Design a binder for this molecule. Structure first.
Ligand SMILES: [Cl-]
Ligand code: NA
Ligand code: NA
Ligand code: NA
Ligand code: NA
Lengths: 216, 459
DNA sequence: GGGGTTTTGGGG
DNA sequence: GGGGTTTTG
DNA sequence: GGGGTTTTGGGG
């Protein structure tokens, strides 16, 4: 039994081709999570790991409406309750986005969240980047391995085996190793991208804009 | 500079004192605030190294050193226990019963590290020789000066360090928790285990498969850059680890930015005993083979003992630089690790073809023995950590016509169209090799632009 | 006082 | 000091 | 000059 709500959600999402409709219903209940940081990075924890929530323009406006005396960029150490949220997969540059791995990210789309101002939360372990956890990383790798394997088995055909004569009696034979490279798929660029999941799309707000909106 | 022994240093003077000591434990230099970096380490010497032995239980006695600085680079990185350190202008005080030396490097204090063994960890990893037996392999500030009178101190302390590490445990039982009890700890704890496997999870991370004296097997993520000295078969002490309650598929240890992985000097009695006591474990592997999906990596092969000392080469170098890098060009035999994505030909029954040694041609045995000697002509389409993101898969061959890799499958070549026993084993092996988290550690020989597997068998 | 530096006598 | 940062592996 | 440090204004 997974004790990390975030780890279980995000894992099932990946284990279900990024289909948020296939993830267990008994997991789509409100999320009461402690706010670790609010700026420059808004990070919340589920008592074990921390993830970066993505607020829709609607979510912030609503918030700002029901809570005028509350600034989101100042919610650090404070707790919030995400009542309406969703999960979707997005291709990102992990070299820049630390809340991701292997150019893949599972995003927590926030639609409605209430700030339970001044609610002391129970003492927990030090929150770690879910996307740096061994198992999760392994789960993501499984995801890519499955996608890669399916791609190659559909791209590589005809048993084009190196003619045995090339490796046998290679006394007066020289070759270039790049002659062993094979395209894993029909991908356009140099980075594998033949995935089946349909990359989720949803307008989200940059944490910087919400900073200006509350203090130009 | 006058050097005083740990147990004799003054507690009252409160004046800067200097000393030479052995480091038996140390945290990784860590940032505390927007301007401070700390590094705590336990030190011992001829006057302080063991507790009143009678009811002490041979528990190691020690002093603690806390170096403060404004920059990470100004603090010492201890990869190995047993090495020596020289400090200048430190203040000694009593902190909860024990002698604590404090030195503000950011002001006027300085440190220097000396290798107790012939080479420092870094020099071992880089196969370099030490400038001399009086040259610090690491030190604070821009300069370090060793006076003639110091030579004796350093030499004697090195001699002492070995006697001490070969005679005692140095890292006594009270200095770490048994992995099979790790789940009972409230917070972080220390570990002392053997590195059974070093799996290259990705570009910047290693995943150590540790097993201690208790027999429990745990995994942990060790950054390559931070701890470049991890080597399978060696015994290490982990400073500050926590039990990961969120890992359900496998026992995991979480490390912090201040956690450290330390090895022991060649003379370490502890390390020696553990290297021999703790024996490789494959339970996790075997068990994981019954699961459609294993979140645990299983190295399916093993190279001939004569290669266990051969360094590995990433596919990236093997197929993208082997023809341009001076070093890679001089070699014809390499050791590498990868995971098989696809095996060719598809039909396992065609893995063994008939070979005509005179015409240099192979052929299907679906027509029977009329094709010559039986040989394996399998073509593996691999990939690894170094090429994980690119849109490529690389071919690694197993053509046994000349004997190379003949016993790879532990199944002597044979007409797979007739020998059901031989066909089944290979088929099964094929499912394993292409199964997620299955990796191959093999030695290959370059030939006419291709790499052939040799001295590598399945286990 | 004493570093490293240049300020080369004097701030906080 | 037996510890909690980051131009966030 | 400016830190750390305590010398708390002044050496080399
Ligand atoms: Cl060649
Ligand atoms: Na001056
Ligand atoms: Na001065
Ligand atoms: Na001064
Ligand atoms: Na002063």
């Amino acid at each position: 039994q997974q004790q990390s709500a975030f780890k279980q959600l995000y894992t099932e999402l990946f284990n279900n081709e990024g289909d948020f409709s296939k993830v267990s219903s008994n997991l789509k209940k409100p999320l009461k999570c402690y706010v670790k940081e609010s700026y420059p990075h808004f990070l919340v924890t589920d008592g074990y790991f921390f993830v970066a929530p993505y607020f829709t323009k609607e979510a912030v406006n609503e918030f700002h409406a029901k809570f005028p005396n509350v600034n989101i960029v100042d919610l650090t150490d404070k707790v919030i309750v995400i009542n309406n949220w969703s999960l979707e997969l997005r291709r990102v540059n992990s070299a820049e986005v630390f809340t991701s791995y292997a150019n893949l990210e599972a995003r927590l789309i926030v639609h409605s969240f209430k700030p339970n101002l001044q609610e002391r939360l129970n003492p927990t372990r030090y929150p770690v980047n879910l996307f740096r956890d061994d198992e999760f990383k392994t789960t993501i790798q499984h995801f890519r391995h499955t996608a890669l394997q399916a791609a190659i088995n559909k791209t590589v055909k005809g048993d084009n085996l190196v003619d045995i004569s090339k490796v046998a009696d290679a006394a007066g034979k020289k070759g270039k190793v790049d002659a062993g490279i094979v395209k894993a798929s029909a991908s356009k660029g140099d980075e594998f991208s033949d995935f089946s999941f349909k990359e989720g799309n949803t307008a989200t707000l940059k944490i910087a804009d919400i900073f200006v909106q509350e203090k130009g | 500079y006058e050097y005083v022994e740990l147990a004799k240093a003054s507690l009252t003077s409160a004046q800067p004192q200097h000393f030479y000591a052995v480091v038996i434990d140390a945290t990784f230099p860590y940032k505390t605030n927007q301007e401070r970096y700390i590094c705590s380490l336990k030190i011992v010497d001829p006057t302080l190294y063991l507790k009143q032995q009678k009811g002490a239980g041979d528990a190691s006695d020690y002093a603690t050193l806390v170096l403060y600085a404004k920059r990470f680079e100004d603090l010492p990185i201890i990869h190995r226990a047993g090495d020596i350190i020289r400090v200048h202008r430190a203040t000694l005080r009593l902190y909860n019963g024990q002698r604590q030396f404090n030195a503000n490097v950011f002001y006027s204090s300085s440190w220097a590290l000396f290798s107790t063994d012939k080479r420092s960890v870094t020099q071992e990893i880089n196969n370099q020789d030490a400038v001399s037996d009086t040259t610090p392999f690491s030190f604070s500030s821009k300069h370090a000066t060793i006076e003639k009178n110091e030579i004796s101190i350093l030499q004697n302390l090195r001699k002492w360090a070995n006697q001490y590490f070969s005679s005692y445990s140095v890292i006594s039982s009270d200095m770490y928790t048994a992995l099979n009890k790790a789940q009972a700890q409230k917070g972080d704890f220390d570990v002392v285990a053997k590195i059974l496997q070093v799996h290259e999870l990705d570009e910047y991370t290693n995943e150590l498969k540790l097993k201690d004296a208790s027999g429990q097997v745990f995994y942990t993520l060790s950054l390559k850059l931070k701890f470049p000295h991890v080597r399978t078969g060696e015994v290490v002490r982990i400073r500050s680890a926590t039990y990961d309650e969120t890992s359900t598929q496998k026992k995991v240890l979480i490390l912090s930015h201040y956690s450290n992985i330390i090895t022991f000097i060649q003379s370490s009695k502890l390390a020696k005993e553990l290297r021999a006591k703790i024996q490789d474990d494959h339970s996790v592997e075997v068990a994981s083979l019954k699961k459609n999906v294993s979140l645990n990596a299983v190295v399916l092969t093993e190279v001939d003992k004569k290669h266990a000392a051969l360094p590995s080469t990433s596919l990236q170098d093997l197929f993208h630089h082997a023809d341009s890098d001076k070093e890679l060009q001089a070699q014809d035999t390499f050791r590498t690790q990868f995971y098989v994505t696809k095996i060719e030909p598809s039909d396992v029954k065609e893995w063994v073809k008939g070979y005509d040694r005179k015409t240099k041609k192979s052929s299907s045995l679906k027509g029977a023995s009329g094709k010559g000697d039986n040989i394996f002509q399998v073509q593996f389409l691999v990939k690894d950590a170094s090429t994980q993101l690119n849109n490529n898969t690389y071919r690694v061959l197993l053509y046994t016509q000349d004997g190379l890799g003949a016993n790879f499958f532990n199944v002597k070549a044979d007409n797979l169209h007739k020998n059901a026993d031989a066909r089944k084993k290979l088929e099964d092996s094929a499912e394993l090799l292409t199964k997620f988290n299955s990796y191959v550690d093999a030695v290959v020989e370059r030939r006419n632009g291709f790499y052939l597997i040799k001295d590598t068998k399945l286990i």
